[PDB]
Design a protein around this ligand. Structure first.
Ligand SMILES: Cc1cc2nc3c(=O)[nH]c(=O)nc-3n(C[C@H](O)[C@H](O)[C@H](O)COP(=O)(O)OP(=O)(O)OC[C@H]3O[C@@H](n4cnc5c(N)ncnc54)[C@H](O)[C@@H]3O)c2cc1C
Ligand SMILES: C/C=C/CC/C=C/CC/C=C/CCCCCCC(=O)OC[C@H](COP(=O)(O)OCCN)OC(=O)CCCCCCC/C=C/C/C=C/CCC
Ligand code: HEM
Ligand SMILES: COC1=C(N)C(=O)C(C)=C(C/C=C(\C)CCC=C(C)C)C1=O
Ligand code: SF4
Ligand code: F3S
Ligand code: FES
Lengths: 616, 153, 250, 129
């Protein structure tokens, strides 16, 4: 629109997949081999996706190390979610873990082995045997210290055998909607500056997370929440965005992950008093408690003068008591990262670490079939025709208020796979590749042009930087209504500064000043939504810790016996999902709340798990 | 007769030429190192010695000149004895070096000695032994001439 | 004020009859991260936002940021800046690739060649997918160590003169090491077809044992060893062992 | 605006598609093998020529160097004499140049051994300077 002109190219596909991480590739494998003419749109070569950075492992009750059941895994996931998790999706997840991880081994994923030639497994945070009652589990399957790397390369390799067609370094700008239906996607081709509209019967969103909304994170530069943003722009409300996982052990200076697997293998955290303080904060699980708990324990230590180093403002991960053949065998990757980025030799010195933004349990709301949904009190859950979402961009929700470690590679694969299963069942040759309405994509092009030639006075790098810092400050590990309200006002001001936007590069070819600006827009949508949702939730649940409201607010008080209590009405408690609708021009956000699904897929296969106090 | 990727490979190159995209520099900017320098020298020597055997073989056969008047011609130039032996070093090095390194490289083809420190130990040894063998094969005849000129029997 | 200076290759395809060019940028090291990628981002963020390069990870796992820095191919994100402010540092794209714009090479042949090795597990007897783990001994899986780690950055192939001259015909260190990774997998049954694919005079045998690939690999791997290994297989000097038999109560 | 054109799948190597038809068993394995065995055998041959001189050795040098240089220049020809840089017929010329090079090498060596002092004497003689 306006100041320049754009080549526009149309395509027709059965399904379009926006993302080639673990989730998008697994769906692409499924759909490709099922016959569908399937297109994979990704803004980077699939192998560079963030999935490839995953380290510690992937969960499945294989029993390679000891007897195990998938229902123990399930329980651990429900408890992990601090009962904001939908128990149907979590049931689906845990039910399929063993088949899913096994397929990966069959595709050639080179798992670490036991002396029996089975897939080696390790312990991880927040996992137990026997519905909480037994010991720490060994359920977490790994390729040493590089499980996601290995998985992504295995999935990419096998995708090449399933006749997909890759639009690599294509940057999606919007879904194409026609009256409540998604009929494709529009994207900019980085290579030659052209503009492509893909028409499709189904569209799968698998775009990853939005860690770069914060100043410090483990995530990749590409984690800018474009998928969630796409959905906002299509008038779809996002779910549970306030629930942001801080990983206990990002390296102090640089944000680089150090796997929780290093604690699973026998490492532990230490304060300036030389104390294994997680013995105090979580007597049973200790250093293998859930991530929300461990990260908070870490932060208190820091706040309470027991921080480590020159400024006493981080903490030590200690592995040097572990045999050096174990470190090399089980954690070669982080041994290397730790030396490169901290000068630290893990056999002799401990690693400086600090909690760090890592994973988004929030995202696009779906049902357990991974079909995207809109909700009203009156109408309930209404599916958005043609549109599926999976992986980190999605909220199924299999993680609720706190994601269990090694459950995300899992949820990518399982629900990536589910997308293909469910589409091959409900899509008939009956249906034809829908036609685009007149003008489809013009808005997205107009926006592109505006950002391309934007000649205001705030360069995007600095606007981004203030957002990231605002977010680090007002929406961190512990939150307070006054600090949150303050943060919100600043965020909506920054969103107003989008109009004063300055870019410099005016080329159409490989203009990363432009795509990074587009990315900022998407980030801002996510970030503003995140904070007003967090501001409004007056409870402490999983990763959302409010200092002014330290209680988990449920329909009953599950800390006392139930009988004789009267259930609080929906509007009065907080055991419910947050839904944020945002107007993308103005920035105005409205909230609504949707009930948590408590039933399983089949009470005969497994019981539901009623809330209880969450300890470790 | 090409493999399918070799065909595709060819069409890729034509596609890139058509777009008049530049080629990122290489020779002029890659750091000199003991891996490709010593490969470079293996090829230069191989080719230099072959070049010589052509210009020597065809040269003397095509020309009225023969090797014997060529040698006596240079002998007649009467050039300093110090230099003469240096020419004999410049002639021996390539044969020594290339032969030794040729065994090395054959090792490389058998996946032997490919770790970085073996590689670097190997490059110095080959360069060094060839420096020794070439120098020895020149110094020894002279050493033994000086003994004929200046000792009793 | 320790002001480091960077000479960075530049190319602008949008420009009428454009041509490559080095540009110099000054960076205050006290205002910058330890790594070369930090300096490039700093520049783009503060000096010239038209400066263009690939990056994604922070820890050198994605493989996106591969380039030539101080004359060697490495990843920017884990290449420490040289503190000596008296010397400059030269930054070029991957050698002998066609460039799209600035430090970004067209990477599509590299990917094509990778697809050609058929990088997925292949079984002679169809197996029912997901039903059971295939057996593999520790010793057998450990053969993949130093092979499976490759991040597809292409630093090695962009360092190999043999590939410089015949990229269209010679597969290169990176693709060949992966070819080998699938050949020595005790679980894969197509080791022969995998070699038949690269029997001709160029595919693998254009390896002149330059050893640049191994010298330059930023993940300390050894594609040369694997190529020697492949040369042995093609020439029938060695043979791939049979898989160890699966145990009775597995 | 969307007054637009129909598009094409990007260029993309489909390795299943490629598989179909292709058998070619054009195995270069044993040539590579013999090339290397041959060079190995030339190792004792070089020092042998240091000690033993004469016609018969002069002949062993000529035969073996000729063979070894033939395979050697063919490699270097295929590196710098590529269709992409010289076009397809000038490439074919240089490839034919490889064979011409080898023949003239041999003819000129056979000549030198037969109607001049020969290889081992020529060296012997320049060392006498
Ligand atoms: C350092 C680290 C380690 C981790 N380790 C583990 C672990 O050990 N176990 C575990 O379970 N989980 C782990 N996680 C979490 C897990 O790795 C991720 O949640 C998971 O890989 C999700 O991947 P995904 O496929 O949803 O998206 P990603 O893998 O991030 O990929 C998203 C894809 O979408 C594409 N995309 C995005 N935006 C656009 C756009 N606008 N246009 C076109 N394409 C676009 C991208 O190009 C990319 O291909 C880890 C996370 C991190 C950060
Ligand atoms: C510019 C580039 C030009 C190069 C020239 C072209 C070379 C062609 C190949 C020649 C190969 C034959 C060399 C041997 C020879 O001719 O006799 C020795 C002679 C002396 O006779 P002379 O001195 O009269 O000999 C008298 C003998 N009593 O000439 C020599 O001295 C050559 C010395 C060769 C080095 C020795 C071989 C080193 C290899 C070691 C590897 C061994 C084991 C592992
Ligand atoms: C005496 C023992 C010798 C051995 C063991 C030997 C070994 C080798 C080997 C292994 C190669 C292959 C290198 C590659 O493929 O990159 C080679 C190449 C070559 N050799 Fe020799 N060689 C010897 C003597 C000679 C001699 C006497 C000549 C005389 C002209 C010669 C000329 C060449 C040439 C031209 C090449 C091609 C170079 C290249 O491609 O880099 N070699 N040699
Ligand atoms: C693969 O052959 C080569 C070597 N073995 C080697 O060590 C080096 C340095 C090179 C570099 C090539 C050179 C010096 C010839 C010039 C060729 C051009 C197209 C400019 C090479 O091709
Ligand atoms: S081998 Fe080392 S360098 Fe070559 S690709 Fe794999 S990682 Fe990059
Ligand atoms: S750099 Fe090149 S020629 Fe062979 S050993 Fe390495 S591939
Ligand atoms: S950004 Fe991933 S290798 Fe550097």
């Amino acid at each position: 629109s306006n100041i320049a002109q754009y080549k526009v190219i149309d395509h027709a596909y059965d399904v379009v997949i926006i993302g080639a991480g673990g989730a998008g590739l697994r769906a692409a494998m499924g759909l490709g081999e099922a016959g569908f003419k399937t297109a994979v749109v990704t803004k980077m070569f699939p192998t560079r996706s963030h999935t490839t950075a995953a380290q510690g492992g992937i969960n499945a009750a294989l029993g390679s190390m000891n007897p195990d059941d998938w229902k123990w895994h399930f329980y651990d996931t429900v408890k992990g979610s601090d009962w904001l998790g939908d128990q149907n999706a979590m049931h689906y997840l845990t039910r399929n873990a063993v088949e899913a991880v096994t397929e990966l081994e069959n595709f050639g994923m080179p798992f670490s082995r036991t002396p029996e030639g089975k897939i080696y497994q390790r312990s991880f945070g927040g996992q137990s045997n026997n519905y909480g009652k037994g010991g720490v589990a060994k359920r977490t399957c790994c390729v040493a210290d590089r499980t996601g790397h290995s998985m992504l390369h295995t999935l990419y390799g096998n995708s090449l055998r399933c006749h997909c067609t890759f639009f690599i370094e294509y940057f999606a700008l919007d879904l194409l909607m026609d009256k409540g239906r998604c009929v494709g996607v529009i994207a900019l081709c980085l290579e030659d500056g052209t503009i492509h509209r893909f028409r499709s019967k189904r569209t799968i969103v698998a775009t990853g997370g939005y860690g770069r909304a914060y100043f410090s994170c483990t995530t990749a530069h590409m984690n800018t929440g474009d998928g969630t943003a796409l959905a906002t722009r299509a008038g779809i409300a996002l779910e549970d965005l306030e629930f942001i996982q801080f990983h206990p052990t990002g390296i102090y200076g640089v944000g680089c992950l150090i796997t929780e697997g290093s604690r699973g293998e026998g490492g532990f955290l230490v304060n300036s008093e030389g104390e294994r303080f997680m013995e105090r904060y979580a007597p049973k699980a200790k250093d293998l408690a859930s991530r929300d708990v461990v990260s908070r324990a870490e932060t208190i230590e820091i706040m309470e003068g027991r921080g480590v180093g020159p400024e006493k403002d981080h903490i030590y991960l200690q592995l040097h008591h572990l045999p050096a053949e174990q470190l090399h065998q089980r954690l070669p990757g982080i041994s290397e990262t730790a030396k490169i980025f901290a000068g630290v030799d893990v056999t002799k010195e401990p690693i400086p670490v600090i909690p760090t933004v890592h994973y988004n349990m929030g995202g696009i709301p779906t049902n357990y079939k991974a079909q995207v949904i809109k909700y009203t009190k009156e109408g309930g859950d209404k599916i958005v025709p043609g549109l599926y979402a999976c992986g980190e961009c999605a909220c199924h929700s299999v993680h609720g208020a706190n994601r269990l470690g090694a459950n995300s590679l899992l949820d990518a694969v399982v629900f990536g796979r589910a997308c293909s299963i469910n589409i091959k069942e409900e899509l008939k040759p009956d249906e034809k590749i829908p036609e685009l309405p007149e003008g489809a994509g013009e808005e997205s092009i107009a926006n592109l042009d505006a950002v391309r030639y934007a000649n205001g006075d705030v360069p995007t790098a600095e606007l981004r930087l203030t957002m990231q810092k605002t977010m680090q400050k007002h929406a961190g590990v512990f939150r307070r209504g006054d600090i949150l309200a303050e943060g919100v006002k600043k965020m909506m001001d920054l969103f107003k500064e989008l109009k004063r936007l300055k870019t410099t590069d005016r080329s159409l070819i490989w203009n990363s000043d432009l795509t990074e600006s587009l990315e900022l827009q998407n980030l801002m949508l996510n970030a503003t939504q995140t904070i007003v949702a967090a501001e409004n939730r007056k409870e402490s649940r999983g990763a959302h810790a409010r200092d002014d409201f330290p209680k988990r607010e449920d329909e009953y008080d599950y800390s006392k016996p139930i009988e004789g209590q009267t259930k609080r009405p929906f509007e009065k408690h907080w055991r419910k999902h947050t839904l944020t609708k945002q107007d993308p021009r103005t920035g105005h956000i409205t909230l609504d709340y949707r009930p948590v699904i408590d039933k399983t897929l089949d009470p005969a296969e497994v019981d539901w798990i009623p809330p209880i106090i969450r300890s470790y | 007769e090409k493999t399918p990727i070799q065909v595709w490979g060819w069409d890729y190159l034509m596609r890139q030429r058509a777009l008049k995209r530049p080629i990122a520099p290489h020779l002029t900017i890659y750091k000199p190192q003991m891996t490709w320098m010593v490969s470079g020298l293996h090829r230069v020597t191989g080719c230099a010695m072959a070049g010589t055997l052509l210009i020597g073989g065809v040269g003397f056969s095509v020309l009225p000149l023969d090797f014997t008047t060529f040698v006596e011609f240079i002998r007649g130039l009467g050039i300093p004895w110090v230099i003469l032996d240096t020419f004999k070093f410049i002639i021996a090095f390539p044969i020594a070096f290339h032969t030794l390194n040729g065994i090395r490289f054959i090792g490389f083809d058998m996946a032997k000695g490919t770790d970085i420190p073996s590689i670097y130990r190997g490059a110095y040894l080959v360069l060094g032994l060839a420096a020794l063998i070439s120098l020895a094969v020149v110094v020894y005849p002279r050493w033994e001439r000086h003994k004929k000129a200046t000792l009793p029997t | 004020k320790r002001i480091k200076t960077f000479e960075i290759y530049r190319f602008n395809p949008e420009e009428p009859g454009a041509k490559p060019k080095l540009q110099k940028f000054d960076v205050d090291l006290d205002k910058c991260g330890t790594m070369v990628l930090d300096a490039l981002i700093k520049i783009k963020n503060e000096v010239d936002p038209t400066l263009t390069f690939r990056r994604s990870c922070r820890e050198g796992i994605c493989g996106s940021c591969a380039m030539n820095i101080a004359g060697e191919n490495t990843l920017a994100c884990i290449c420490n800046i040289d503190q000596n402010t008296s010397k400059t540092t030269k930054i070029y794209p991957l050698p002998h690739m066609f460039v799209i714009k600035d430090l970004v090479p067209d990477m599509n042949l590299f990917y094509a060649q990778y697809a050609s090795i058929q990088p997925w597990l292949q079984k002679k007897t169809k197996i029912n997918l997901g039903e059971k783990q295939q057996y593999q001994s520790i010793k057998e899986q450990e053969k993949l160590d130093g092979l499976y780690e490759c991040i597809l950055c292409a630093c090695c192939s962009a360092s190999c003169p043999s590939y410089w001259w015949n990229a269209d015909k010679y597969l290169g260190p990176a693709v060949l090491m992966q070819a080998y990774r699938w050949i020595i997998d005790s679980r894969d049954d197509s080791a022969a077809e995998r070699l038949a694919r690269m029997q001709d005079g160029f595919s693998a045998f254009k390896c002149h044992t330059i050893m640049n690939c191994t010298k330059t690999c930023p993940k300390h791997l050894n594609p040369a060893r694997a190529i020697g290994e492949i040369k042995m297989l093609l020439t029938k000097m060695k043979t791939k062992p049979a898989p160890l038999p699966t145990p009775a109560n597995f | 605006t969307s007054a637009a054109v129909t598009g094409a799948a990007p260029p993309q190597f489909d390795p299943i598609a490629a598989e179909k038809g292709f058998k070619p068993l054009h195995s270069h394995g044993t040539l590579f093998k013999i090339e290397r065995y041959f060079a190995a055998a030339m190792v004792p041959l070089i020092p042998a020529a240091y000690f033993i001189h004469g016609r018969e050795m002069d002949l062993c040098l000529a035969l073996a160097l000729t063979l070894h240089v033939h395979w050697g220049v063919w490699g270097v020809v295929n590196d710098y004499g590529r269709p992409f840089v010289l076009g397809d017929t000038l490439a074919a010329a240089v490839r034919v140049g490889a064979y011409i090079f080898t023949a003239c090498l041999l003819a000129g060596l056979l000549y030198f051994n037969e109607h001049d002092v020969g290889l081992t004497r020529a060296f012997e003689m320049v060392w006498e300077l």
